């Protein structure tokens, strides 16, 4: 709700009120040939409920100059909260979302027990990331190893059920997993955010002759074009085209707008109090 | 290539376009109703539609009389090939007209 | 459907700290609102009736008066913006995209299509080396006609039937639960 | 030529150089892009 | 997209003496993260960037016009008040 | 209050509430007007959204 | 909807996109002479225009 009308056009509409109503008591109403006085209380009070969708119980001025300033105020107003809620809904239309985990460096990956409930994350053994977790994350590796997955697959519908909800492993088969993945709901962190950067390689039998034949072969593949028509057969996926969703509008997402409120709570108090003060003296 | 039966008479029910057009039909002799497999019969249909229609126009401007037939295989035509006798052969309308 | 149900209670309910408190800060001010006219005072602009012909008197609660006001603008305004997000932001899509769809490259055994045996898609498919994958799944699956095939899509049978556009196209447009794709 | 013994450069690993000189395991993944030039434009509220 | 996805490398003689603990020593880097630290330090930088759709909020450039409406019907009403009391004089 | 001075005020209401109109005096029909308000408001909201 | 449909298009898709496929005098593309980018546009034949 803070999205559009950045703050210099709330500021300025509410110097213009302020501006508006002073000439509307004061030149307008005091002057009028006709013309319950209106103040600046309820000139304040009339033109800034014209604003927000105009519900409150006036007092209306009788001059008619101060009845056509209050009608073009109308007129402002109307396109305000046309041009309020026009942009609101293209923010809402038009957002992106952030991912609630940052990296392998989180909170949650470095102390699951210490956070909220227990982050659930695990990998398979007797592989690469278990030999890269182990000498780099000594306490993350204890904590991964009473959730260990036999395979991909098993891992992959952990996430989906609840048994998990993170899945450490190599960054190309999990790449290629949350491609062809049907309603595109598991993705990879980062946006494909990849750690202990590696590849994949052919490993040949130390000191022999044909590393150098295999090692030229496959640069070939790269300058020839082949490996990008290979990367299109193979590890394309449904899911690597392409967002945004529509999505309720919980407490959370509106704390914004009851704080305002709880705050107005906090302001009204302070001025009751400052009124019992000047009444005293 | 619409096949509907034919009316008891033996002749095609008469309809018409959505203009008022009359329908041209043709009285086909295809393979009976419900596939051939079982009830082996040349049941006679009634055949109407775009290419029927253009074989309508094209026997008018070339002076052609003709009979249609539906092909009894219900294929389109593929050479299938014969193990038996390490050949191939047409299928459908394919091996009809070959 | 734009407001969770503890959001709806949420407002609800401050619609009542307000009411009870524009009572308290204007009754206890130096020189107003019953608490029914409080109570409608708040409903009242919320809900946007004339309802109720009381507005608070006291400095104090006309800054809250003024704020509630603009709390009540931003509910009714992110109502309209939330329906206009989840009325355009309302595609299922997930529809194939060709020939060249991964789906139809590398089938699963949940997805079936096929086409109609012993025509010219059959021998198009084995005829190139690089459909070798996509005939095998077709060959089991193939149909007699494309009259069934067609009904197979329609029963849920089939997933996808691949076939003359010609033909297709004139399905599509006279049974409004079939679309061609890619 | 002789005048380095090593190059530490962004040097890309290619089939072409990789038959006269020795790479080593890539430092840095990447690969080629093309690189292009790059608010609100609401007229007045008429 | 990214196409010839090629990376960069040491460059090294034939013979080179330092070939094998060369790459020993950048594949042990990767792993103990020391590649991620020259990557945070010098190049994860994003000083400024945007999306593509990028909804923008409205400034007062957009909604200068209808404030200088108001503003109009002010020095318009200073105008028109005039009239009141000059048709109210009349009668 | 008559039949037509609730038509008046149930309809303006539901249209973006911006004529006058005469609200009832009871307790329950302002009750009843405060629920159609809520319609209304609801009403308007689905009409601009949808629209 | 006005404020919905802002999106300005025509962005170059890659080295596929047609207005790289073949050299159009009204569109300036190059890169560093003597690198990787040049011994790989000419080594490869399909891409020589
Ligand atoms: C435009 C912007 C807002 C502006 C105005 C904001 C107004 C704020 C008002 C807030 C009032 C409190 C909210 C109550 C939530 C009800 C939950 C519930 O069970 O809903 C049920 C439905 O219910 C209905 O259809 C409506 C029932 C309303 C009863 C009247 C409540 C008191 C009115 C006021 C008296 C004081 C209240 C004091 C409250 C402390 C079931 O929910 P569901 O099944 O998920 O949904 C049904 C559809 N479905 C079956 C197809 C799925
Ligand atoms: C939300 C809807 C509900 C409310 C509806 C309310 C009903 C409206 C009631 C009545 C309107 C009656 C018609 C007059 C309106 C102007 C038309 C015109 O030709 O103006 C021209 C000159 O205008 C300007 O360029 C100046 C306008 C803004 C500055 C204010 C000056 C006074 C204009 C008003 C004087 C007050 C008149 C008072 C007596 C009637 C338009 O210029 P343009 O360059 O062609 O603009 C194109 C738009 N564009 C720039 C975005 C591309
Ligand atoms: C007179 C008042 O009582 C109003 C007038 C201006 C208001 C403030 C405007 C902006 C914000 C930012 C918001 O940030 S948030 O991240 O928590 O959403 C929290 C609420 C806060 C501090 C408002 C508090 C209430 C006000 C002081
Ligand atoms: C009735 C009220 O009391 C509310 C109703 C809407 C509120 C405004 C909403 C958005 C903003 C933008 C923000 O600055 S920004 O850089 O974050 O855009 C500063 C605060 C400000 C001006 C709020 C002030 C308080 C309100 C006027």
Redesign the pocket.
Known sequence: ???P???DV??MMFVMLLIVSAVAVFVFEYFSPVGPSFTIGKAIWLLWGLV?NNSVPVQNPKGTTSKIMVSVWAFFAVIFLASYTANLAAFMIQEEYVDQVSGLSDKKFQRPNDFSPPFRFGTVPNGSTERNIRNNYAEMHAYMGKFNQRGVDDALLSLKTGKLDAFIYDAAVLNYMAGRDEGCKLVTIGSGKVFASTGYGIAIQKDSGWKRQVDLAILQLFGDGEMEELEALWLTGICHNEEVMSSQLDIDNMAGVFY?LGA?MALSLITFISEHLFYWQ | VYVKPTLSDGTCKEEFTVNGDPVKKVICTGPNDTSPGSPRHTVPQCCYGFCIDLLIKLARTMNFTYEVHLVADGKFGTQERVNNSNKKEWNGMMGELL | QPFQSTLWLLVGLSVHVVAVMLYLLDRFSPFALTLSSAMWFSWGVLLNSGIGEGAPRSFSARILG??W???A??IVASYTANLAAFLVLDRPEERITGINDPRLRNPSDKFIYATVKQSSVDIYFRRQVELSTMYRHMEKHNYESAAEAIQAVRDNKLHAFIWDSAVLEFEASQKCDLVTTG | SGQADMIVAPLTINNERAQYIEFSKPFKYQGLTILVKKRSTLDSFM | ELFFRSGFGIGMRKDSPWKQNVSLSILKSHENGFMEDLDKTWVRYQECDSRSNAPA?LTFENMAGVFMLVAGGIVAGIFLIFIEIAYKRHK
């Open positions: 709700f803070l999205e009308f950045s703050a709330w500021v927000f305002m107005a | 003024m704020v006001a603009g709390f603008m931003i | 909020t």
